[PDB]
Design a protein around this ligand. Sequence first.
Ligand code: CA
Ligand code: CA
Ligand code: CA
Ligand code: CA
Ligand code: CA
Ligand code: CA
Ligand code: CA
Ligand code: CA
Lengths: 173, 173
Amino acid sequence: EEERQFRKLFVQLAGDDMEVSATELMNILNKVVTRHPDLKTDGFGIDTSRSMVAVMDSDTTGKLGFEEFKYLWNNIKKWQGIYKRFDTDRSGTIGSNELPGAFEAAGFHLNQHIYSMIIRRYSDETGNMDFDNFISCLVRLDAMFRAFRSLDKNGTGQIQVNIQEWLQLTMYS
Amino acid sequence: EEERQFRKLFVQLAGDDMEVSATELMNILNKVVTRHPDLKTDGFGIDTSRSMVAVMDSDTTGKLGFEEFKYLWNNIKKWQGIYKRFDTDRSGTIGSNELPGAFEAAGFHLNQHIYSMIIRRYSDETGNMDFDNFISCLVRLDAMFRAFRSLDKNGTGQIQVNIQEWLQLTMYS
Ligand SMILES: [Ca+2]
Ligand SMILES: [Ca+2]
Ligand SMILES: [Ca+2]
Ligand SMILES: [Ca+2]
Ligand SMILES: [Ca+2]
Ligand SMILES: [Ca+2]
Ligand SMILES: [Ca+2]
Ligand SMILES: [Ca+2]
C-alpha cells in the first residue's frame, strides 16, 4: 500500500507533464515544513529547488521522472528523521556538535576539514544549519559521492575529467 | 576619485570584521537591482549569496576580503553591462538567442551542449534568465574554469582528483 500511496502522491505532484519540476518540488517541500513546525527553516526557495532537481536529473530532461523523484523523496524522508533525532537540544536546527552524528547516521564518514568546510558553507554564525540547508547539503553530498564513484571506474581513488565533463558536473548542479 | 570611492564602499560594506559576509553581499546586490529596475529579477536571496561567497572565498575565511570582493565586484560590474547591451529585445532578461553573445562578450567560448545545460539549469520555461541567475551563473562559470586550469598542472586537458579534493571543489561552492 506504500508503493500505491506514493504513486498517487507522484501522479498528483507531477501533473500533466508526468514530471516534477523545480517549482512543484519547492511547493511540496514547503508543505512538509509547514506540517512540521519543529523544523526551523526560512523555507526552500526556487534556487535551492532548481539545484536539487539538477543534481537529481540523471536523464537531463530538466525535471524529475518517477524514479528520480522516488530516490530523492525517500532520501529526504530518511534525512528528515535523522535531523529530528540528532537535534538533541531541540533547537530545530543542526549545530556543529550535532552534525557529525547526523551525517554518520546518513551514511557519510567525513573528516574534520570537510566538516569545517560544510559548516562554513551551510551553517550560520553560530555554526547552526536549518532544515532546507541540511537537506540541500545532503542531497548534494550524496550526488557528489555517487558521481565520483561513477567516474572512478578502476577503483584507484582518483577520477580524471576533461573540461566538458568538469563543466557538466559542476554547472548542472 | 573612484578608487577612493571603492575602498570607501568596501569599508562601509565590510564593517567591523573587515570582511564581506554572504548577508552583506546580499544587501548590496539587492540595492543594485533596486536602483536598476530595467534588470528583471526576483532578487538575490541568501542561498545564491552564500554560494557566490563560497566560490569566491579563496582563503576559506568564510567571507570576502578586500581583494576577493574587489575581483567579484568588478566582474559583476562588467557582466551587468553585458546583460544590458546583449538584451537586444529589451525584455530585461537574457533569452536563449541572446545568451551565446553575452557569454562570448564575457570571455566564454562554450559549445551547444554546455549552452543547453546552462539554459536548462538557469533559464525559465521560455528559455529566459533573469539578472541574479545570469550573475550567479557567470560567477560560478568563471570559478570553475579557473579551478580547472589550476588543477590541470601539466596542461593535458585532464585533471585528476581524489575524493577529498572533489568534495572541497563541489561542496564548497
Ligand atoms: Ca509537472
Ligand atoms: Ca529527468
Ligand atoms: Ca540542535
Ligand atoms: Ca535555509
Ligand atoms: Ca562584515
Ligand atoms: Ca576570504
Ligand atoms: Ca532579452
Ligand atoms: Ca532569479
